[PDB]
Structures are given as C-alpha cells and as structure tokens.
Amino acid sequence: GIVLFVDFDYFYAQVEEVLNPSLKGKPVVVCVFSGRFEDSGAVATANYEARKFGVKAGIPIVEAKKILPNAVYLPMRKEVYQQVSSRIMNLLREYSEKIEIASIDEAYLDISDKVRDYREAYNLGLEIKNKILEKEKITVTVGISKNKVFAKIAADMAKPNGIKVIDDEEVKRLIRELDIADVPGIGNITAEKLKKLGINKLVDTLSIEFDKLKGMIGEAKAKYLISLARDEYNEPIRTRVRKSIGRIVTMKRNSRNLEEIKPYLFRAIEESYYKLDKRIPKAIHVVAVTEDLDIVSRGRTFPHGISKETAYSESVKLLQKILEEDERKIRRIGVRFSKFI
DNA sequence: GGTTGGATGGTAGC
DNA sequence: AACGCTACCATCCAACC
Ligand SMILES: [Ca+2]
Ligand SMILES: [Ca+2]
C-alpha cells in the first residue's frame, strides 16, 4: 500500500501572512495570550524566520521577546485557521475518498486505488502542492511512503515547501539508522528515557525485553515502536474518533472564591458544548490548574447523558469539592467532557 | 482476570 | 525559570461481575 501525508507549513503563521502579505520575510510568532499581564502567554507556533533564533511553540512569550523584540507577535485566531484548514481538507478529498484528519494542519490520504507506484505518487503530490498553492496561497510539505508513520517522517525531512518519497528499501535503512527521537509521537522526554535504556534507533527496540521497554514508556508507545521496527506497522487511514472534549481558561487573578470562579467555569462549559456539536457525554471532569501549575481533577460519570444545564449544576458541585479537598489557589479552571454515546 | 470509575501523575505537539 | 492550551496515555486503588 501507498500513503500520502500533507502537512501545512508553519500553518498559523502562514494564514496570518495570507491575511496580511506585508509579513512576507518577517519573523511571525503566533501567540496564546492569557490576559494576566501585557505579553503573558505561550507561543503556539512561529514561522521559519523566527525559529531560526529559538522562537518555537511551547516557550513563554517573554523568552521570545528577549530573543526577537522586533518580531511581529500576533494573537491566535483558531477559528480562522480552522476555516482555512477545512477548505484545504475539502481539496484533499478530490484526490482520495480515504482520508484521515490527524490535526488542524495534517492529513493522510490512502492513495492505493489512485496510483500504482511511487513515481505517480510523487506526481500526484506535486498536483496537491500546486492545487493548494492555487486556491489558498498555502505551501505544504508532502511525504509519501508505505505507511502513515514513514510518510510523516518523509515530510519532516523535506520541511518547508518540500516533497519526498521513502521507498521500501529506505524504510529498511531508516529502521536501522534514523534517530529514534525523529519518530512521530516520540517527544524529547521519551527520547531521553529511550537513550537511557540504550535505544538510539528503531531497530534497538528488538534487543531489549518487551517488559523493560513497556515499564519505561508505556505499553502503547512500546508496541508502536516494536511494530515499526519489524516493518509490520499498517494502521488504516480512518476518521479519528475524539474521546473527550473541553475547555480550560486562565483566570484574570488566582482565586478560591466560588462566585469569582463560577463565571469562568460557566464560560468554559459553554464553549465546550458548542464544540461537542450533537455528541452527548455521560461524564464531566472539572479541571482546576493551581497556583503552581499542578492539576486537581474532580469528576462524575452519570447513568444517563449530560445536558448543558446539568453540566452547570454539576460543575459547581465538583468545583466546591476541589476547594474543600485542596487549599491551593486556582489559576486556570475548566471542564472536560467524555464517554460519548 | 477484565472492566468501569475516579484520582494522581504525566506526555506530544500546534 | 518565565509559561498556554487540547487531548491523549499511565498507574493505583476500590468496587464490581
Ligand atoms: Ca504539523
Ligand atoms: Ca479511590
């Protein structure tokens, strides 16, 4: 089988530039502002001219303004990027019925009944690149391989505005020689734990006993890496079913005052319910993030489904419970629905 | 032995 | 260290079939 993975480059930053072409060539840093102070928050994503100097998703905004004070710092407009993403995903469906929306900027297309060999895949890849450039003025990277994972690695090597096939013999080679930290799903925490066990390449996961690997990185990532290592991985391309939905917001000031927090929790429940869109949850968890960024969850599963109005009533009960059983001040508050019918 | 449930701890990645 | 946010996984213990 053949798989084609499209990744939209520095996506949030690219859309900001489509909407204001005077950003071409400038360092653009899309940010999530908390409302605490001037410029308090975290970088959601930055374009290649900002990443050049260390300004990446995750780091605090104040770190970034120390590195690039004259960079354009924009607030995040998820609703806008979502719309753009959805219009690009629609173009992608013209090339394949079998598609998987992995995220707001990532999709996999199974193209096994659309092309015979990797030559054609490349050509269709340029046809997807040109098409998205044509309609939305967005560059993307295309990666083609025999499975979802090596198609995503192909895009990673060819990043910005690239395209790259990985044929069967280079899969064999990469199981042997690819830094294992560049395997999708393997962050820096997991890369350091693996490096402590002496696993630097995918093939090294077959020397260590399975239980010693599972005991370190969980059964899920264990089976995943051993599978890629055998060259046996072959998960189908499918609609990702979301298991939970919710919002948590940052409060203006830290607090332990039910009536001061109520409005935020209620605001988060509203937004969560619109995101649910016809899905009926049976479970609610209130998540309070404390003064020191630790987390305090209280929850309930119901015999029956949860209405918006029941969620308000039940979230106050659960929040009251956090205030009784834990006396730290709360900084962020919100809600997490799950167990959909 | 497996599952549902809730609390605590933790992770990848835009 | 600073610091936002969605959603996912992992471990323990309790209660249960
Ligand atoms: Ca991406
Ligand atoms: Ca318990």
Residue numbers in the entry: 1 to 341
Please give the exact wording used by the authors of the publication that reports this structure.
Y-family polymerases are able to bypass a variety of DNA lesions that impede high-fidelity replicative DNA polymerases. Our kinetic primer extension studies demonstrate that the bypass polymerase Dpo4 preferentially inserts C opposite oxoG, and also preferentially extends from the oxoG•C base pair, thus achieving error-free bypass of this lesion. The Dpo4 polymerase embraces the 19-mer template/13-mer primer DNA by its four domains: palm (residues 1–10 and 78–166), finger (residues 11–77), thumb (residues 167–233), and little-finger (residues 244–341).
In the case of the postinsertion binary complex, a covalently incorporated cytosine is positioned opposite the oxoG site and forms a Watson-Crick oxoG•C pair. Residues 3–19 of the template strand can be traced in the electron density map. The finger domain is positioned directly over the Watson-Crick oxoG•C pair with one Ca2+ cation coordinated by the D7, D105, and E106 at the active site of Dpo4. Upon covalent cytosine incorporation, there is retention of little-finger contacts with the phosphate groups of C7, T8, A9, and C10 on the template strand, and the phosphate groups of G6, A7, and T8 on the primer strand. By contrast, the contact of the thumb domain with the phosphate group of T13 is relocated to the phosphate group of A12 on the template strand. At the same time, related thumb-domain contacts on the primer strand are displaced from the phosphate groups of T11 and A12 to the phosphate groups of A12 and G13.
